[PDB]
Amino acid sequence: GPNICTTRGVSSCQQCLAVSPMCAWCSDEALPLGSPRCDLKENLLKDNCAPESIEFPVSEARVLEDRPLSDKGSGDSSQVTQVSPQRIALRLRPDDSKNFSIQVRQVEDGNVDLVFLFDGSMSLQPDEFQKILDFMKDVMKKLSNTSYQFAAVQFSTSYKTEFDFSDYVKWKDPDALLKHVKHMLLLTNTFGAINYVATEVFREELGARPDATKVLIIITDGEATDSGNIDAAKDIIRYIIGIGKHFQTKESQETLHKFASKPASEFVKILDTFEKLKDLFTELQKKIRSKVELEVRDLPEELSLSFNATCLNNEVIPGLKSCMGLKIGDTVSFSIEAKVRGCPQEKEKSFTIKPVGFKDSLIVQVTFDCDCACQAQAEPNSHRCNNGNGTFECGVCRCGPGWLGSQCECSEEDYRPSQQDECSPREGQPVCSQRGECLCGQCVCHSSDFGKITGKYCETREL
Ligand SMILES: *[C@@H]1O[C@H](CO)[C@@H](O)[C@H](O)[C@H]1NC(C)=O
Ligand SMILES: *[C@@H]1O[C@H](CO)[C@@H](O)[C@H](O)[C@H]1NC(C)=O
Ligand SMILES: *[C@@H]1O[C@H](CO)[C@@H](O)[C@H](O)[C@H]1NC(C)=O
Ligand SMILES: [Ca+2]
């Protein structure tokens, strides 16, 4: 009962390895004409194929950079390790996959870049617009002396940065930052206003931090008067907050989903009164820096994935990518499996796994292992496979054009040997009628300088 490695009918060592991650290849050169070269290292060894002649690579994962996770006695030297390990060298066989783990622990509180994109349309009364202003100031007042950094972009018809991160980091004065704020009293171009924040506000030269969390807090009282797409703000955590008379219907409050992040059950917050703005943020603030979601970057196309997350109390949740509801010092762990489809050419690839809002990341160097090591003495068209006709790599003949078979002989063949008794009419009879050899199961006739024997079984010397 030969299994998959044998039964694939392989022609080279590189294809035997590509059968399955379990298969192995023999290359003993001086072996019988019939003994499957592709098998397992045990079944292959029950036939004597020598030690060093068997080609069998194995996938492996090795941990390179494995800094230990930081502690509560935090002293910023080489910063603080929040993800470990950081560098792992993977080596994969054709259609192979092995597993490895990662551990995340927010030893720092968490750096956040938050932007108040608040409506200023003609629908707001001066009191509620002030309440929206008092909402922003109150948010920034109890979040000073944290790792937060704030901006604010009033919008209506036009879009105006009231202050950006370089201002806040300098002053840390909520009232004096938003004291210049004047009510626009116009329309609601939410699409263009959201693009403004993604392209003009989150700029590093305006106090932005390239490793912090991108958080948008959209506060609106009605539906958008413009139209477009917010694809520029696809990597920003967006909270939209429709408020008031113009979201009393379930229809009108569903429009904000296209702006809000997903799931919209979490990132859409409909209010009937501007007074509820006070309590609304004290609960969003509990869902901002409390979830670690892994982020796969620059992933090669031929790499598959898998995840087994261990979140709260050893809750092994397969598939999951994020563990939420964490505090300072809590540690999580994720087990990951990476499969490959075949064998890409690219000798070395490198992709990053990093939690969102963090700078510590896991970088994976994947070097594929497909080619065999018996290419030393590949030998194009060797003396063993007849000259000019067959490469003798890894103990077998990879014949060129027209020629096939063992020592390269087949002309235009029959597309398998199968029953080798095609060369004679009956059991107790010589093969080829004693005028030729049984090449590839069919009887080819011996041409001589005198007569030519044109016929199956080599019978009629035509002269
Ligand atoms: C700021 O917070 C730190 C703790 O992180 C504390 O030691 C310090 O006294 C605080 N200062 C002010 C002005 O809030
Ligand atoms: C996760 O667990 C499932 C079930 O035990 C298993 O099939 C899968 O290979 C595991 N994956 C990883 C990456 O641990
Ligand atoms: C090898 O095959 C080619 C045709 O494919 C033929 O011309 C050549 O003669 C063959 N080699 C020998 C040694 O006969
Ligand atoms: Ca409005």
**3-state SS, residue 362:** strand
Tell me how crowded residue 262 is: count the other CB atoms within 10 A of its CB: 10
Structure token pair of residue 436:
């030729």
Decide: 300 and 317 in contact? Cβ < 8 Å.
Answer: no
Among 337, 351, 331, CA closest to 308: 337
Beta sheet of 322-323, edge-to-edge order: 60-65, 87-92, 362-368, 349-355, 292-297, 322-323
Cα 373 to Cα 37, 56, 369: the distances in Å are 15, 10, 10
CB 368 within 8 A of CB 343: yes
> Any residues with CB less than 8 A from the CB of 113 and at least 6 apart, and which?
149, 151, 165, 202, 208, 209, 212, 213, 214, 215
Name residue, tokens 């920034």.
Answer: 140
Q: Tell whether the torsion through CA atoms of 246, 250, 255 and 257 is positive or negative.
A: positive
Q: Which atom of ligand 3 is nearest to the CA of 400?
A: 5
Q: What does this entry list as its resolution, in Å?
A: 3.2
Cβ of 389 closer than 6 Å to ligand 3, yes or no, is yes
From 389, 392, 410, mutation site for ligand 3 pocket: most ligand atoms within 8 A of C-beta: 389
Atom 10 of ligand 2: nearest residue by CA position? 308
Q: Coil, strand or helix: which one is 154?
A: strand
* Cα 400 to middle of ligand 3, angstroms: 9
DSSP type of residue 69: P
* Whether the CB of 411 sits within 6 Å of ligand 3: no
CB of 352 closer than 8 Å to CB of 359? no
Whole-angstrom distance, CA of residue 437 vs CA of residue 424: 11
Is there a contact between 220 and 186 (Cβ–Cβ < 8 Å)?
no
Mutate to test the pocket of ligand 3, among 387, 397, 409 (most ligand atoms within 8 A of CB): 387
Give the C-alpha distances (Å, rounded to integers) separating 311 from 105, 286, 339.
Answer: 11, 17, 24
Tokens of 228: 């477009």
- DSSP string of 168-221, one letter each residue: HHHH--HHHHSTT-----B---HHHHHHHIIIIIS-GGGT--TTSEEEEEEEES
Q: In sequence order, what are the residues at sequence separation of 6 or more whose Cβ sits closer than 8 angstroms to the Cβ of residue 53?
A: 26, 27, 28, 29, 395
Burial of 401 (0-12, 13-18, 19+ CB in 10 A): exposed
How far is it, in rounded angstroms, from Cα 211 to Cα 233?
16
337 lines ligand 2 (CB under 6 A): yes
Phi, psi of 192 (to 5 degrees): -65, -30
Q: Quick one: 112-285 is in which CATH superfamily?
A: von Willebrand factor, type A domain (3.40.50.410)
Which residue's CA is the nearest one to ligand 3's atom 2?
389
Asked if 257 and 268 touch (Cβ cutoff 8 Å), the reply is yes
Radius of gyration in angstroms for the set of CA atoms belonging to the chain, rounded to a whole number: 36
Q: CA dist 278 to 133, 135, 281, 380, Å?
A: 11, 6, 6, 80
Hey, CA dihedral for 183, 189, 190, 193, is it positive or negative?
negative
Helix (H) or strand (E) holding 141: helix 126-141
What are residue 294's DSSP bridge partners? 355
DSSP 19: T
| Nearest-10 crossing angle of helices 277-284, 126-141 | 30
Q: Amino acid identity of 359?
A: K
Backbone angles phi, psi at 174, to 5 degrees: -60, -40
How far apart CA 220 and CA 58 sit, in angstroms, is: 58
- Asked if 5 contacts 22 with a C-beta cutoff of 8 angstroms, the reply is yes
Atom of ligand 3 nearest to the CA of 401: 5
Cβ distance 154 to 188 under 8 Å? no
Residue 76's contacts (CB-CB under 8 Å, 6 or more residues apart) are none
Mutation test residue for ligand 2: of 97, 102, 308, 337, the one with most atoms within 8 Å of CB: 308
Q: Which residues contact residue 96 at a Cβ distance below 8 angstroms, ignoring those fewer than 6 apart?
A: 21, 59, 339, 340
> Which residue precedes each gap in the chain (C to N above 2.5 Å)?
none
- DSSP string spanning 314-332? S-EEET--EE-S--TT-EE
Distance in angstroms (rounded) separating the CA atoms of residues 185 and 355: 41
Would you state the structure tokens that stand for residue 63, as one six-digit string?
A: 């941990």
Q: Is 137 exposed, middle or buried (0-12, 13-18, 19+ CB in 10 A)?
A: middle
Give the C-alpha separation, 323 to 309, whole Å.
7
Residue nearest to atom 5 of ligand 2 (CA): 318
Written as six digits, the tokens of 165 are 């991160």
The experimental technique used to determine this model is X-ray
Ligand nearest 223 Cα, by number? 4
Nearest to 139 by CA among 168, 166, 109: 168
Binding site membership of 401 for ligand 3 (Cβ less than 6 Å): yes
The verdict on the CB of residue 304 being under 6 Å from ligand 2 is no
Residue 11, amino acid: S
- Beta strand spans in 280-319 (E): 292-297, 307-310, 316-318
Query: Which residue, chain included where needed, has tokens 């300098």?
Result: 170
**What's the Cα-to-Cα distance from 349 to each of 346, 366, 410, rounded to whole Å?**
7, 5, 42
Among 315, 337, 353, which residue has the most ligand 2 atoms within 8 Å of its CB, making it the best to mutate?
337
Distance in angstroms (rounded) separating the CA atoms of residues 19 and 206:
55
Query: How many Cβ atoms are within 10 Å of 267's Cβ, its own excluded?
Result: 21
**Rounded to an integer, what distance in angstroms lies between the CA atom of residue 60 and that of residue 19?**
18
Phi, psi torsion values for 194, nearest 5 degrees: -70, -40
Among protein residues, the one whose CA lies closest to atom 7 of ligand 3: 388
What amino acid is encoded at 72 in this protein?
K
Q: What is the DSSP string of 110-136?
A: --EEEEEEEE-BTT--HHHHHHHHHHH
**Ligand 3: centre distance to CA 388 (Å):** 5
| CA–CA dist 91, 95 (Å, integer) | 12
**Rounded distance from Cα 438 to ligand 3 centre (Å):** 20
How many A from CA of 339 to the centre of ligand 2? 13
